[PDB]
Ligand binder design. Structure first.
Ligand SMILES: CSC[C@H]1O[C@@H](n2cnc3c2N=CNC[C@H]3O)[C@H](O)[C@@H]1O
Ligand SMILES: [Zn+2]
Length: 364
């Protein structure tokens, strides 16, 4: 059982005297609450390469060329290109067995990384398109795979699901919204991913989801190539989201920074994703430092461990190494993520008690 760091204990840890390996041991011991991780793009290199071989998908490529062709581990051009490679990766959604395996593995690896609260998200209609799978059996496979691992683990990690709509056709977004609500019992939130579009047009679809009791967190303010910040205004003012996926472009506008703070919105920051997709110049210039210092609530997230060949503790390493975040900062961020989690209040209460009970400093 991971020896999770406690709030009152952090002042005794000297990270400056540690090797990279020893720091990773400390990142593992942070009780992490992760809000933004696409389960359908969450795997290791090994898992991915097996899948490709299992279905004889690339007989002309070495393992290394398969990783290069399909994934984004060295970074790319833009979110646009990222969306194009995701489409390619859908080569592996061959059947429901591989899907269930994917879900077991993803949860197991989060557990070993020291995540205690995990909101996974996935896009059913996406996962279905390549082989025209049935979204109902896709969901059953994922829920089954998750339940089995959580049970095996004695509920040591708490997992919830969010449903993502993708694309810019009302028909597909509506079909996802209906699926999400049909499966309200499993889904705790509703998202939009894919190319970044202004969601204001789909107001009535999102209203209906939000008003049926499923809160919203949509991808917005990620893609630096958009000619304005309209997508952020829409998510906040029209969709009335509780959280924003990425939202890093909020840093470009004092008006938006004030809006997010005043509305108590949390930004689900994905540091490595933004650098690899060219939405931040380098980790040294990542807006999370500005936003955190401006008093915006932000949490740390991996986004797509499979596309980047990373895990959540790599994001912590980069933030510590490039931007000088501290263990205190990390604990504060995870407690914000805990408070803004869409999971049941009973579960959040348990987690608070288990991991976030003390205070950083003694009463004086
Ligand atoms: C199997 S991924 C299904 C999808 O969800 C989308 N997505 C996955 N990871 C992210 C996605 N969308 C936008 N921003 C990049 C990243 O956060 C992806 O482009 C595809 O549209
Ligand atoms: Zn994402």
């Amino acid at each position: 059982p991971i020896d999770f760091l406690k709030k009152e204990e952090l002042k005794n840890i000297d990270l400056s005297q540690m090797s990279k390996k020893e720091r990773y041991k400390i990142w593992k011991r942070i009780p992490k609450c992760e809000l933004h991780c696409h389960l359908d793009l969450c795997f290791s290199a090994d898992f991915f390469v097996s899948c490709i071989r299992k279905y004889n998908l690339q007989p002309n490529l070495s393992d290394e060329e398969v990783l290069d062709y399909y994934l984004f581990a060295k970074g790319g051009k833009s979110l646009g290109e990222f969306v194009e490679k995701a489409i390619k990766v859908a080569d592996i959604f061959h059947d429901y067995e591989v899907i269930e395996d994917l879900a077991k593995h993803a949860v197991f690896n989060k557990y070993k990384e020291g995540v205690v609260l995990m909101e996974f998200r996935y896009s059913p209609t996406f996962v279905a398109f390549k082989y025209n799978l049935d979204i109902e059996l896709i969901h059953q496979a994922i829920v089954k795979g998750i339940k089995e691992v959580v049970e095996l683990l004695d509920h040591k990690i708490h997992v919830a699901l969010m449903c993502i709509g993708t694309g810019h056709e009302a028909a597909n977004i509506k079909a996802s919204a209906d699926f999400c609500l049909k499966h309200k019992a499993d889904f705790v939130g509703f998202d939009h991913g894919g190319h970044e579009v202004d969601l204001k047009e789909y107001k009535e679809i999102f209203d209906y989801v939000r008003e049926s009791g499923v809160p919203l967190s949509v991808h917005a303010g990620e893609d630096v190539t958009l000619p304005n910040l309209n997508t952020l205004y829409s998510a906040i003012q029209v969709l009335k989201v509780e959280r924003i996926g990425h939202g890093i472009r909020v840093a470009e506008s004092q008006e938006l920074i004030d809006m997010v703070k005043e509305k108590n919105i949390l930004l689900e920051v994905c540091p490595i994703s933004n650098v690899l997709l060219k939405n931040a110049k380098s980790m040294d210039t990542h807006p999370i430092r500005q936003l955190y210092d401006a008093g915006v609530k932000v949490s740390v997230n991996s986004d797509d461990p499979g596309m980047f060949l990373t895990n959540i503790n790599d994001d912590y390493e980069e933030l510590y190494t490039h931007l000088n975040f501290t263990l205190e900062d990390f604990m504060k961020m995870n407690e914000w993520a805990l408070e803004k989690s869409f999971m049941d209040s009973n579960i959040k209460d348990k987690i608070k008690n288990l991991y976030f009970k003390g205070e950083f400093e003694a009463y004086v």
